[PDB]
Design a protein around this motif. Structure first.
Motif, PDB file in Angstrom:
ATOM      1  N   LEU A 102       0.805  -1.224   0.000  1.00 49.62           N
ATOM      2  CA  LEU A 102       0.000   0.000   0.000  1.00 49.62           C
ATOM      3  C   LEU A 102       0.857   1.304   0.000  1.00 49.62           C
ATOM      4  O   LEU A 102       1.358   1.702   1.029  1.00 49.62           O
ATOM      5  CB  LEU A 102      -1.070  -0.017   1.091  1.00 49.62           C
ATOM      6  N   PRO A 103       0.995   1.970  -1.170  1.00 52.72           N
ATOM      7  CA  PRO A 103       1.845   3.120  -1.333  1.00 52.72           C
ATOM      8  C   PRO A 103       1.934   3.961  -0.048  1.00 52.72           C
ATOM      9  O   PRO A 103       1.015   3.957   0.774  1.00 52.72           O
ATOM     10  CB  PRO A 103       1.093   3.935  -2.379  1.00 52.72           C
ATOM     11  N   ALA A 104       3.034   4.680   0.088  1.00 49.21           N
ATOM     12  CA  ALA A 104       3.319   5.526   1.252  1.00 49.21           C
ATOM     13  C   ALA A 104       2.148   6.414   1.841  1.00 49.21           C
ATOM     14  O   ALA A 104       1.908   6.381   3.066  1.00 49.21           O
ATOM     15  CB  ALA A 104       4.557   6.337   0.957  1.00 49.21           C
ATOM     16  N   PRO A 105       1.418   7.181   0.987  1.00 50.67           N
ATOM     17  CA  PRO A 105       0.402   8.163   1.377  1.00 50.67           C
ATOM     18  C   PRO A 105      -0.982   7.736   1.877  1.00 50.67           C
ATOM     19  O   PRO A 105      -1.771   8.624   2.325  1.00 50.67           O
ATOM     20  CB  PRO A 105       0.205   8.969   0.096  1.00 50.67           C
ATOM     21  N   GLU A 108      -3.349   4.652   7.451  1.00 51.52           N
ATOM     22  CA  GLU A 108      -4.103   3.603   8.135  1.00 51.52           C
ATOM     23  C   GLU A 108      -5.526   4.116   8.313  1.00 51.52           C
ATOM     24  O   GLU A 108      -5.736   5.315   8.611  1.00 51.52           O
ATOM     25  CB  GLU A 108      -3.542   3.280   9.533  1.00 51.52           C
ATOM     26  N   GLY A 109      -6.493   3.214   8.162  1.00 48.89           N
ATOM     27  CA  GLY A 109      -7.875   3.556   8.388  1.00 48.89           C
ATOM     28  C   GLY A 109      -8.596   4.220   7.221  1.00 48.89           C
ATOM     29  O   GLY A 109      -9.847   4.270   7.222  1.00 48.89           O
ATOM     30  N   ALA A 110      -7.860   4.734   6.227  1.00 54.57           N
ATOM     31  CA  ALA A 110      -8.544   5.308   5.038  1.00 54.57           C
ATOM     32  C   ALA A 110      -9.520   4.308   4.358  1.00 54.57           C
ATOM     33  O   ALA A 110      -9.393   3.077   4.560  1.00 54.57           O
ATOM     34  CB  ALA A 110      -7.525   5.800   4.042  1.00 54.57           C
ATOM     35  N   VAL A 111     -10.459   4.794   3.548  1.00 54.79           N
ATOM     36  CA  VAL A 111     -11.181   3.843   2.651  1.00 54.79           C
ATOM     37  C   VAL A 111     -10.566   3.874   1.234  1.00 54.79           C
ATOM     38  O   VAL A 111     -10.292   4.960   0.752  1.00 54.79           O
ATOM     39  CB  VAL A 111     -12.719   4.086   2.635  1.00 54.79           C
ATOM     40  N   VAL A 112     -10.356   2.706   0.606  1.00 60.81           N
ATOM     41  CA  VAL A 112      -9.472   2.565  -0.597  1.00 60.81           C
ATOM     42  C   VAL A 112     -10.035   1.633  -1.679  1.00 60.81           C
ATOM     43  O   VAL A 112     -10.272   0.422  -1.423  1.00 60.81           O
ATOM     44  CB  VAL A 112      -8.170   1.793  -0.298  1.00 60.81           C
ATOM     45  N   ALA A 113     -10.230   2.146  -2.889  1.00 58.18           N
ATOM     46  CA  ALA A 113     -10.508   1.243  -3.929  1.00 58.18           C
ATOM     47  C   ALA A 113      -9.305   1.172  -4.814  1.00 58.18           C
ATOM     48  O   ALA A 113      -8.717   2.220  -5.120  1.00 58.18           O
ATOM     49  CB  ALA A 113     -11.682   1.731  -4.669  1.00 58.18           C
ATOM     50  N   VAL A 114      -8.959  -0.041  -5.272  1.00 52.25           N
ATOM     51  CA  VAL A 114      -7.796  -0.228  -6.152  1.00 52.25           C
ATOM     52  C   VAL A 114      -8.179  -0.665  -7.558  1.00 52.25           C
ATOM     53  O   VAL A 114      -9.128  -1.384  -7.687  1.00 52.25           O
ATOM     54  CB  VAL A 114      -6.883  -1.315  -5.590  1.00 52.25           C
TER      55      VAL A 114
ATOM     56  N   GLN B  51      -8.673  11.425  -2.431  1.00 51.46           N
ATOM     57  CA  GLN B  51      -7.297  11.463  -2.811  1.00 51.46           C
ATOM     58  C   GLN B  51      -7.101  10.330  -3.730  1.00 51.46           C
ATOM     59  O   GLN B  51      -7.842   9.384  -3.649  1.00 51.46           O
ATOM     60  CB  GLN B  51      -6.436  11.342  -1.549  1.00 51.46           C
ATOM     61  N   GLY B  52      -6.129  10.429  -4.619  1.00 61.26           N
ATOM     62  CA  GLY B  52      -5.816   9.330  -5.482  1.00 61.26           C
ATOM     63  C   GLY B  52      -4.322   9.232  -5.569  1.00 61.26           C
ATOM     64  O   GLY B  52      -3.674  10.216  -5.266  1.00 61.26           O
ATOM     65  N   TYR B  53      -3.791   8.065  -6.002  1.00 64.62           N
ATOM     66  CA  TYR B  53      -2.344   7.799  -6.165  1.00 64.62           C
ATOM     67  C   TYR B  53      -2.158   6.801  -7.330  1.00 64.62           C
ATOM     68  O   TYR B  53      -3.117   6.182  -7.819  1.00 64.62           O
ATOM     69  CB  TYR B  53      -1.775   7.207  -4.852  1.00 64.62           C
ATOM     70  N   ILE B  54      -0.943   6.617  -7.791  1.00 63.31           N
ATOM     71  CA  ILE B  54      -0.719   5.542  -8.708  1.00 63.31           C
ATOM     72  C   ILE B  54       0.553   4.990  -8.149  1.00 63.31           C
ATOM     73  O   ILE B  54       1.343   5.710  -7.470  1.00 63.31           O
ATOM     74  CB  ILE B  54      -0.578   6.007 -10.191  1.00 63.31           C
TER      75      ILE B  54
END
Ligand code: NI
Ligand code: NI
Lengths: 119, 120
Positions: A102-105, A108-114, B51-54
């Motif tokens: 999981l990239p640096a930024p 913890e605890g965020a919600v994330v779609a990949v 926020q977004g990242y790649i």
């Protein structure tokens, strides 16, 4: 050399109309038939390419699969997940914790779609 | 009675896809592009904390500290898609390791498998 690619595409082609069949067969779990599925007509499904809708959720598979295929399939698909950062691992319901990089930024605890992208 | 964090989950999904595709149409990049790129809709006023990242040519969109019902609401509007080999009790995908699933009985050992959650 390697055109298990056409075999990968056939499995994904096959997984797609499997999914579209679920969308209109709620509460089912099968191997729908190849009639009922809507597949090209010119496409002749290599017995060994199987499918199953379970609760809802298409699984398309090859049981004695030629080496090269794991790769060929992974590569023609993306992959798409949802969960929360905890910790360093992605926590997703119905799917348990998955360990992606999981990239640096992402806190913890965020919600994330990949989502990934082919070649 | 009701929240429409469902609008927010939808905005997330929508932002996500603008990264997905720019990510492609711009290979070799590690975020974290500003929304002027992306090419977002006129009307859309992104709400940070969207926020977004790649990282690799794969992209992530994330709300840094979530509101409630937001994971669910988002998991719902997505679907989900994996592939990998069945090692038993498991789906081994060589970027996300071994992902442990409800794997139908009739799919037997060592089978290569494409999984497309039906988001219901
Ligand atoms: Ni629907
Ligand atoms: Ni491409």
């Amino acid at each position: 050399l390697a055109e298990v690619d056409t075999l990968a595409r056939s499995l994904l082609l096959y997984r797609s109309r499997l999914a579209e069949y679920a969308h209109a067969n709620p509460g089912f779990s099968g191997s729908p038939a190849d009639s009922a599925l809507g597949l090209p007509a010119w496409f002749r499904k290599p017995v060994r390419l199987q499918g199953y809708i379970a609760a809802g959720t298409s699984y398309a598979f090859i049981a004695s699969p030629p080496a090269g295929l794991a790769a060929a399939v992974d590569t023609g698909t993306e992959s798409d997940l949802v969960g929360v950062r905890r910790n360093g691992q992605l926590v997703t319901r119905r799917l348990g914790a998955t360990a992606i990089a999981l990239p640096a930024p992402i806190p913890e605890g965020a919600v994330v779609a990949v989502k990934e992208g082919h070649h």
